[PDB]
């Protein structure tokens, strides 16, 4: 939540085989929002986490409200 309201970045739990390109396509085609950066990591439990930074044209809070997890 701190990242969403500060850096306009959404944090997702993504698929293990998803790379930065596919996460960008999936986010773009699922929320109609253009990311400008994707940085990922593998959590110690064997799950992947993606930080999707949005364009200044979009508000990450608005997308978060639309998704419903806000």
């Amino acid at each position: 939540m701190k990242k969403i309201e500060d850096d306009n970045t959404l944090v997702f739990h993504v698929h293990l085989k998803a790379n930065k390109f596919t996460i960008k396509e999936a986010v773009r085609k699922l929320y109609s929002v253009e990311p400008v950066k994707i940085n990922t990591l593998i959590r110690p439990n064997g799950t992947k986490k993606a930080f999707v930074k949005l364009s200044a044209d979009a508000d990450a809070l608005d997308v978060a409200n639309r998704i419903g997890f806000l």
Binding site: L16, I42, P44, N45, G46
Partner: protein, 35 residues
């Protein structure tokens, strides 16, 4: 270490999460065991 294969991350996570308290409602459904 640090430079660990991803299978190890799954392997380590599953081994650790096995050490986990068995839920209360689990017992209520007759029987569930350890190990």
């Amino acid at each position: 270490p640090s430079h660990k294969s991803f299978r190890t991350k799954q392997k380590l996570a599953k081994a650790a999460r096995q050490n986990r308290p068995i839920p209360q409602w689990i017992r209520l459904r007759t029987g569930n065991t350890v190990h």
